[PDB]
Amino acid sequence: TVQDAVEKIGNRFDLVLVAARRARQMQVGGKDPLVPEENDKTTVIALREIEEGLINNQILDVRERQEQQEQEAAELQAV
Amino acid sequence: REEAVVWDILDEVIREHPVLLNRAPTLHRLGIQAFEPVLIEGKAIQLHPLVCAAYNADFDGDQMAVHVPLTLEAQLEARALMMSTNNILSPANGEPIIVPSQDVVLGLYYMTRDCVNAKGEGMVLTGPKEAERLYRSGLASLHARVKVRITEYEKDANGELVAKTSLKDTTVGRAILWMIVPKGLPYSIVNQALGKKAISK
Amino acid sequence: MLKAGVHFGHQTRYWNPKMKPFIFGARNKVHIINLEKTVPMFNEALAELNKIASRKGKILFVGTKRAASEAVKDAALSCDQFFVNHRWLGGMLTNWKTVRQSIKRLKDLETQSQDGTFDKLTKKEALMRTRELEKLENSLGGIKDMGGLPDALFVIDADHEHIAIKEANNLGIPVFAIVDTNSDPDGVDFVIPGNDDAIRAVTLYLGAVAATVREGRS
Amino acid sequence: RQMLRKATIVNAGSSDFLEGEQVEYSRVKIANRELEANGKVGATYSRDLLGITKASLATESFISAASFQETTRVLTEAAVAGKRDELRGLKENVIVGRLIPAGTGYAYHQDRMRRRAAG
Amino acid sequence: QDLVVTEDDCGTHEGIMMTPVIEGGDVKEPLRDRVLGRVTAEDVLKPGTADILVPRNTLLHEQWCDLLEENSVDAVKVRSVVSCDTDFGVCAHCYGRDLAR
Amino acid sequence: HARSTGSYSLVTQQPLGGKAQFGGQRFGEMEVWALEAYGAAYTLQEMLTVKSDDVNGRTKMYKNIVDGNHQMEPGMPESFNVLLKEIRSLGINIELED
Amino acid sequence: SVTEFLKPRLVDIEQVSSTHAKVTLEPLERGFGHTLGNALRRILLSSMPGCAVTEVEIDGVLHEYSTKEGVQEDILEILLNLKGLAVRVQGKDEVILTLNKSGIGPVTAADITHDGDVEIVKPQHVICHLTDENASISMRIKVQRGRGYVPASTRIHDACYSPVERIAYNVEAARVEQRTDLDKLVIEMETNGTIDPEEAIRRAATILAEQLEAFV
Amino acid sequence: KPRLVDIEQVSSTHAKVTLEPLERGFGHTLGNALRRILLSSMPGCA
Amino acid sequence: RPIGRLLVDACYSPVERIAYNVEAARVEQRTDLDKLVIEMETNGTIDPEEAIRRAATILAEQLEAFVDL
């Protein structure tokens, strides 16, 4: 059931959009899952991370802007 | 060509991906609903008994169209919004949509029934021993008039589980049906009388 | 006065006329690598790695040299990336197409011991098959996780891993190598004039690499 | 609420004596006139209890009206009047082929609407 | 069709008075079924004290508390979609509490 | 009957009827209200654009599933473009502004 | 061979605490789900060798529809708690214990006299509660060895010799490579009479094998 | 354990086999299990 | 290729009908003992004594794995 995820993100419609945003990060091949997987797809794995309380609309914006600075540091510094 | 390896890959492909089922007369939003597609050796599609009440589709040559949810967004939408587990309560009324209809209601009322005297008379029991004794032999299914220790519980005053067990008077069928109740609620008292109006409540 | 005080100099008068603007000044047999001309390189290179690491790319640390093999994984494997601490096969960057084929029998070879599928065939057979792992899991065991050419290659000594760098500049895969006095830096697009040897030089920088890469992707 | 949409004007000032108009336009005009320019502009009105079929007929979008109502009557009247669509409704978005402003699409439609102010 | 839920809550505090139907004979529809899943604007409960909250959602627990604490309170005010402050669509509070979960 | 992709009609780029050339199994106007009531915009968008109407959208969507990228590039349905052409033929001057 | 059937390979059990458990047997032939499961259900409930309380003699009152001075729980309620008490006898067939205790507070099972052959698995098992001031009790409790459930009505001149409290098997279909229907037997079992679930199910199947040996 | 004997052979097709000594719960159990085996799993030729 | 070889639905089951009946009995020193009488009807291709013995052997092979786990 998705009720545990609704308790964290109260809107319900945003839970679909935020999970769909988190799904394409793992599905396309960018990031790896934080929570240990049990042979589940990106749709279910994304929802598991909402219930535990790691990923949300706020953290994704902070994490994405962090990676922009990290990638720029990789190009500049050789070692 | 349809090789043996195709069905192995097909099971993994349809592991965590919902399929939007729908009836012919889609009046309400409850008609069009998603569910986890399981494999089955047969042409006819298997639809749940509780889901049949909301959709209103009696098994008498009634078709049900499927729909594979493509993309990442629709899979999350069907699993969250349009799922069977999520859509429990009705849209119009506050009461539960997915409930016991005909077969489930008759079976519960058949078990929870006070027969005249019957086998057993008034033999007391701990709790689980009553269900084992009634199921095996000697004691009847209905029985009626047989006190037993029921581990009651109720999350009162906003602070975890509360209350304790007590030797409440009940039927043999009511003692077996009490195990189905999940921690809280009434416990023992709710199982008595019948399951016509109180079953849905 | 910082940690950069371990790779002062190396490789005697053999040198290489090309590697000059990076020579502090020859003294006592061998010359020295002007660290002041190394400070910018110290990060400029790392900056790109840090930048590219954020793009969730790939990094292959090449160090077939003994004094760098066993001591390279902790910086690549542990940091979860790519490395080749052994005989760099011929084409693992250009003819990858046919090379990857070897990786398969390696992976499926692993699964053999995984389950009871290892107790198959004569006890002798398993032995003849297990040897393949020794070679495979060694020459490729640390690259198997590469489902496609990388996006940047960081090689230790620019001399030994010669062929390695070659194929690279032929595929368009940037190369960050820590050359040396007798090294040919013309093949490195990101030179790091440092002691190609020195048990400490290798470790420090090598580990320092994965450092920026580690959190490169934030 | 959908039935009692239209409302006839009583007082004179902003509105045209006794012209038929929605409650949304009258409430916005009354609130704007109450504290900005002058109190005399904010004219009073009375709500008209319109039917389901009557209220459904009155609509801004041409594409939405063509789907529900008759095609011949809607298209002929809209062509002569020369009314541009620019519909933000659910019915118009479904026929046009886009994310309708409801549920998931409401977040995208609200964000897209904010971009239209500057560019 | 085009109508939908917009904004957090309305500025105004208007609402229709909810009572049992009392259709000729005996209670054809109780107060509990009428008010359940509907918000209150204010409604001064009891004989001058507090009892009920200002802009609180009347849940099953809130309805049970009101039913237990003085059953004599027949009438009670509540917001609706008809008397909404917002022009475009309707408020989340003013609508009610009708949902699946 | 079941069908992934196959035949398409000439007038309005849409799939065939049903149980002959291609297994359609029509969605209908009533089912759109059920999707709109539940609030599934992306599920409703793909049904009446990506995997039905759009020729360019269907070709782009097919490659995405095979590669394992998912997502959708809907664009214009084409059935709406026919309505512009049919309206154009009957004296009315309809055109997409901006 | 053609006549030889495909045997089951369990190697999968779900233990939820000491008492409760859920054992499973995945590959089973057509008609072998309900078969075996229903037979084992008949064996587990009826024939499960153990030890439990049969006869009790109390010092205060001679009969079972009365109340003891200083105890809130009635004699009928105490008799039900005595059934739940786990008892295991090594050498002796029958043994008579004594409940020597007094004082303000609850009666733990650890209060009971610890004899040579006698063993108790749960010393926290609640029997009765003693009220304020003084009050005292000294009852001689008898234990008997048997096969199955023997009630008090059958005793002319309520025993539970079964360690199992509740038994429930569930049959769902399963796939096996190039197959359609193989039953998946999941035996849910609840115990209290000092026996492990793996030990109980093994002993139950052994009884059926001894019976079938003469037939085969 | 039971002793298998007393074969009341009616015809070539039909028969009535008996197992006399059985425990209180051993009548239904083995009989019902054997009924499930005999109907489902029965080697033959056709 | 044998087109002449017309196929038939195979039926490899000797039993036509089965019926067990449990009746009480009083043997040399006993209290309460059931008498299992298994009535069996066959096609006539296998003996009743041979069929019941083979049926019990199948259950023993299935029960053999359940002991050691």
**Complete DSSP assignment for C113-143:** HHSGGGS-S-HHHHHHHHHHHHHHHHHTTTT
Q: Is I touching H (3+ C-beta pairs, cut-off 8 A)?
A: yes
- The two tokens of residue E24 are 């000729």
The whole-angstrom separation of Cα B5 and Cα A66 is 43
- Which chains are within 8 Å of G by 3+ CB pairs? B, H, I
Give residue for tokens 């030890």.
G51
Residue G185 sits at φ, ψ, to 5 deg, of -85, 115
Angle (CA) A54-A59-A60 rounded to 5° is: 110
Contacts of B42 in chain F (CB under 8 A): none
Angle (CA) E15-E20-E26 rounded to 5° is: 165
**Crossing angle of the two packed helices A13-28 and A42-52, in degrees rounded to 10:** 120
Range of the domain at D103: 52-118
Contact call for residues C91 and C167 (beta carbons, < 8 A): yes
Q: Measuring CA to CA, which residue among C170, C180, C172 is closest to residue C152? A: C172
| G51-61 per-residue burial string, b: 16 or more CB within 10 A, e: under 16 | bbbbeeebeee
What are the residues whose beta carbons fall under 8 Å from the beta carbon of G148, sequence distance 6 or more? G45, G46, G47, G48, G161, G162, H24, H25
Burial class (CB in 10 A: 0-12, 13-18, 19+), D110: exposed
Q: Measuring CA to CA, which residue among C67, C62, C76 is closest to residue C176? A: C62
Residue H7: its H or E element? strand H4-8
Strand pairing of E57-58 and E38-39? antiparallel
Q: Which residues of E are annotated as a binding site?
A: 10, 84, 91, 94
- The two tokens of residue G36 are 């075996």
Which segments within G103-163 are labelled E, that is strand? 105-106, 118-119, 129-130, 136-146, 149-150, 159-160
Helix (H, G, I), strand (E, B) or coil at A62: helix
* Dihedral sign computed on CA atoms, order E51, E57, E58, E60: negative
The whole-angstrom separation of Cα F54 and Cα F13 is 7
Contacts of H29 in chain G (CB under 8 A): 38-39, 42-43, 208
Nearest CA in chain A to D103: A13
Helix, strand, coil tally for chain C in percent (to 5)? 45, 5, 50
The whole-angstrom separation of Cα G168 and Cα G37 is 9
- Are the Cβ atoms of G216 and I65 closer than 8 angstroms? no
Neighbour tally for B179: CB within 10 Å? 14
HSE-CB at C78 with a 13 A cutoff on CA atoms is 11
What are the residues whose beta carbons fall under 8 Å from the beta carbon of D51, sequence distance 6 or more? D3
Nearest CA in chain F to D66: F83
Contacts of I58 in chain G (CB under 8 A): 5
Helix, strand, coil tally for chain D in percent (to 5)? 50, 10, 45
Q: Which of H3, H24, H36 sits opposite G35 (nearest CB)?
A: H36
Give residue for tokens 């020459």.
C139
Strand pairing of C60-62 and C82-84? parallel
B80 at interface of A, judged by CB pairs closer than 8 A: yes
- The two tokens of residue C123 are 């006890």
Domains observed in chain G: 2-49+162-216 (3.30.1360.10), 50-161 (2.170.120.12)
Does residue C66 fall inside a structural domain? Answer: yes
Contact call for residues H17 and I52 (beta carbons, < 8 A): yes
Give the CATH number, domain containing residue D95: 1.10.150.390
- Integer CA distances (angstroms), G135 to B135, G67, G75, G79, G130, in order: 41, 13, 15, 19, 7
CA C72 to chain centre: 8
Minimal CA separation from G212 to chain I, in Å: 6
Say which amino acid occupies B191: N
Q: Measuring CA to CA, which residue among I23, I21, I16 is closest to residue I38? A: I21
Q: What is the distance between the terminal CA atoms of chain D, rounded to a whole angstrom?
A: 35
Residue G163 sits at φ, ψ, to 5 deg, of -65, -30
Q: Which of B39, B124, B133 sits opposite G80 (nearest CB)?
A: B124
Minimal CA separation from I50 to chain H, in Å: 11
Contact call for residues C155 and C175 (beta carbons, < 8 A): yes
G147 at interface of I, judged by CB pairs closer than 8 A: no
Strand pairing of E16-18 and H14-22? unpaired
B73 at interface of D, judged by CB pairs closer than 8 A: yes
Return the CATH superfamily for domain A1-79: RNA polymerase subunit, RPB6/omega (3.90.940.10)
- The two tokens of residue C139 are 């020459």
User: Last residue of some domain: C108, C140, C172?
Assistant: C140
Q: Measuring CA to CA, which residue among H27, H26, H22 is closest to residue H3? A: H22
Q: Measuring CA to CA, which residue among C105, C126, C127 is closest to residue C116? A: C126
Same domain, C26 and C82: yes
The whole-angstrom separation of Cα H39 and Cα H12 is 19
Contact call for residues G48 and G148 (beta carbons, < 8 A): yes
* Dihedral sign computed on CA atoms, order G210, G211, G213, H1: positive
The whole-angstrom separation of Cα A75 and Cα C54 is 9
Nearest CA in chain B to D104: B77
Contact call for residues G86 and G192 (beta carbons, < 8 A): yes
Q: Which residues are bridge partners to E5 per DSSP?
A: E90
Q: Measuring CA to CA, which residue among F26, F11, F14, F9 is closest to residue F83? A: F11
Structure determination technique employed: cryo-EM
Nearest CA in chain H to G37: H33
The whole-angstrom separation of Cα G187 and Cα G189 is 6
Give residue for tokens 């304790």.
B164
Helix (H, G, I), strand (E, B) or coil at G142: strand
Residue H4: its H or E element? strand H4-8
Residue D53 sits at φ, ψ, to 5 deg, of -70, -40
Q: What is the distance between the terminal CA atoms of chain F, rounded to a whole angstrom?
A: 44
Contact call for residues G6 and G29 (beta carbons, < 8 A): yes
Helix (H, G, I), strand (E, B) or coil at G71: strand
G36 at interface of I, judged by CB pairs closer than 8 A: yes
Q: Which residues are bridge partners to B19 per DSSP?
A: B35
G206 at interface of I, judged by CB pairs closer than 8 A: yes
Enumerate the H helices of chain G as residue ranges: 34-46, 75-84, 197-215
Residue B7: its H or E element? helix B4-13
B82 at interface of F, judged by CB pairs closer than 8 A: yes
HSE-CB at C88 with a 13 A cutoff on CA atoms is 26
Range of the domain at C204: 21-88+152-218
Burial class (CB in 10 A: 0-12, 13-18, 19+), B133: buried
Q: How many domains does chain C have?
A: 2
In three-state form (DSSP H/G/I as H, E/B as E, the rest C), the secondary structure along chain I is CCCCCCCCCCCCCCEEEEEEEEEEECCCCCCCEEEEEEEEEECCCCCHHHHHHHHHHHHHHHHHHHHCC
Q: Measuring CA to CA, which residue among D95, D99, D101, B72 is closest to residue F77? A: D95
Q: Which residues are bridge partners to G53 per DSSP?
A: G143
Angle (CA) C176-C179-C180 rounded to 5° is: 165
Minimal CA separation from B29 to chain G, in Å: 32
Contact call for residues B30 and B97 (beta carbons, < 8 A): yes
Residue G53: its H or E element? strand G50-57
DSSP letters of chain F?
Answer: ---SS--B-SSSS-B--SSSSS------HHHHHHHHHHT-HHHHHIIIIITTT-HHHHHHHHHHHHHT---------SHHHHHHHHHHHTT-------
- The two tokens of residue B123 are 């033999």
Q: Write out residues 161-200 of G within 8 Å (CB-CB) of B.
A: 162, 164-167, 175, 177-178, 180-181, 190
A32 at interface of C, judged by CB pairs closer than 8 A: no
Minimal CA separation from G45 to chain B, in Å: 7
The whole-angstrom separation of Cα A76 and Cα C172 is 18
HSE-CB at G214 with a 13 A cutoff on CA atoms is 14
Q: Which of F2, F40, F70 sits opposite B78 (nearest CB)?
A: F40
Name the CA dihedral angle for I53, I58, I60, I66, rounded to a multiple of 10 degrees. -170
Residue G109: DSSP 8-state: G
Q: Measuring CA to CA, which residue among I37, G211, I18 is closest to residue H38? A: I18
Interface test with E, best of B89, B155, B156 (most E CBs within 10 A): B89
The whole-angstrom separation of Cα D29 and Cα E82 is 19
HSE-CB at F65 with a 13 A cutoff on CA atoms is 16
B11 annotated binding-site participant? no
The whole-angstrom separation of Cα I33 and Cα D28 is 93
Nearest CA in chain G to B129: G165
**Crossing angle of the two packed helices H28-40 and I48-67, in degrees rounded to 10:** 110
Helix (H, G, I), strand (E, B) or coil at G66: coil
| B106-123 per-residue burial string, b: 16 or more CB within 10 A, e: under 16 | eebbebbbebeebebeeb
Nearest CA in chain D to E88: D24
Residue B156: DSSP 8-state: -
Say which amino acid occupies H9: Q
Strand pairing of G13-14 and I33-42? unpaired
Q: Write out residues 51-90 of D within 8 Å (CB-CB) of F.
A: 75, 79, 84, 90
Contact call for residues B66 and B19 (beta carbons, < 8 A): yes
* Dihedral sign computed on CA atoms, order C108, C112, C116, C121: positive
Same domain, C78 and C163: yes
Q: Measuring CA to CA, which residue among D91, E4, D55 is closest to residue F29? A: D91
Say which amino acid occupies I28: E
Contact call for residues E4 and D102 (beta carbons, < 8 A): yes
F89 at interface of A, judged by CB pairs closer than 8 A: no
Helix (H, G, I), strand (E, B) or coil at D104: coil
Which segments within C115-212 are labelled E, that is strand? 153-155
Contacts of F42 in chain D (CB under 8 A): 99, 104-105
Helix (H, G, I), strand (E, B) or coil at D17: coil
Contacts of A12 in chain E (CB under 8 A): 101
The whole-angstrom separation of Cα I7 and Cα E85 is 79
The whole-angstrom separation of Cα D94 and Cα D100 is 7
The whole-angstrom separation of Cα E94 and Cα E77 is 12
The whole-angstrom separation of Cα B151 and Cα B188 is 9
Contact call for residues B72 and A23 (beta carbons, < 8 A): yes
Residues in chain A, overall count: 79
Q: What is the distance between the terminal CA atoms of chain A, rounded to a whole angstrom?
A: 47
The whole-angstrom separation of Cα G183 and Cα E44 is 65
Rg of chain H taking only CA atoms, in angstroms: 13
C177 at interface of A, judged by CB pairs closer than 8 A: no
B62 annotated binding-site participant? yes
- Integer CA distances (angstroms), A75 to A45, C157, D53, D68, I44, in order: 32, 21, 65, 58, 87
- The two tokens of residue C108 are 């499926």
Residue B56 sits at φ, ψ, to 5 deg, of 65, 55
How many Cβ pairs closer than 8 A exist between chain A and F? 9
- Which chains are within 8 Å of H by 3+ CB pairs? G, I
- The two tokens of residue C132 are 């393949």
Contact call for residues E38 and E16 (beta carbons, < 8 A): no
Residue H15 sits at φ, ψ, to 5 deg, of -165, 165
The whole-angstrom separation of Cα F43 and Cα B81 is 11
Q: Which residues are bridge partners to I36 per DSSP?
A: H19, I22
Contacts of I25 in chain H (CB under 8 A): 20
Q: Which of H1, H19, H41 sits opposite G29 (nearest CB)?
A: H41
Residue D83: DSSP 8-state: -
Q: Which of F39, F42, F69 sits opposite A28 (nearest CB)?
A: F69
Q: Measuring CA to CA, which residue among B54, E89, B21, B80 is closest to residue F38? A: B80
Contact call for residues C139 and C155 (beta carbons, < 8 A): no
The whole-angstrom separation of Cα B52 and Cα B47 is 7
Contact call for residues H33 and I38 (beta carbons, < 8 A): no
Q: Is B touching A (3+ C-beta pairs, cut-off 8 A)?
A: yes
Nearest CA in chain F to B32: F34
**Crossing angle of the two packed helices G197-215 and H28-40, in degrees rounded to 10:** 70
- Integer CA distances (angstroms), E71 to E49, E64, E74, F10, I49, in order: 16, 10, 8, 70, 79
Contact call for residues B150 and B166 (beta carbons, < 8 A): yes
Name the CA dihedral angle for I43, I47, I52, I56, rounded to a multiple of 10 degrees. -110
Q: Which of F43, F65, F72 sits opposite B78 (nearest CB)?
A: F43
Contacts of D63 in chain E (CB under 8 A): none
Contact call for residues A48 and B79 (beta carbons, < 8 A): no
- The two tokens of residue B55 are 């959709």
In three-state form (DSSP H/G/I as H, E/B as E, the rest C), the secondary structure along B34-97 is EECCCCCCCCCCCCCCCHHHHHCCCCCCCCCECCCCCCHHHHHHHHHCCECCCCCECCCCCCEC
**What distance separates the 2 farthest-apart alpha carbons in chain C?**
64
Which segments within E16-90 are labelled E, that is strand? 16-18, 38-39, 57-58, 76-78
Nearest CA in chain F to B73: F42
Q: Which residues of E are annotated as a binding site for Zn(2+)?
A: 10, 84, 91, 94
CA C88 to chain centre: 10
E11 at interface of D, judged by CB pairs closer than 8 A: no
How many Cβ pairs closer than 8 A exist between chain B and F? 66
G73 at interface of B, judged by CB pairs closer than 8 A: no
Contacts of A20 in chain F (CB under 8 A): 42
E101 at interface of A, judged by CB pairs closer than 8 A: yes
Burial class (CB in 10 A: 0-12, 13-18, 19+), A33: middle
The whole-angstrom separation of Cα A67 and Cα A51 is 24
Helix (H, G, I), strand (E, B) or coil at B23: coil
Residues in chain G, overall count: 216
- Are the Cβ atoms of A42 and B72 closer than 8 angstroms? yes
Q: Measuring CA to CA, which residue among A51, A28, A29, A48 is closest to residue A37? A: A48
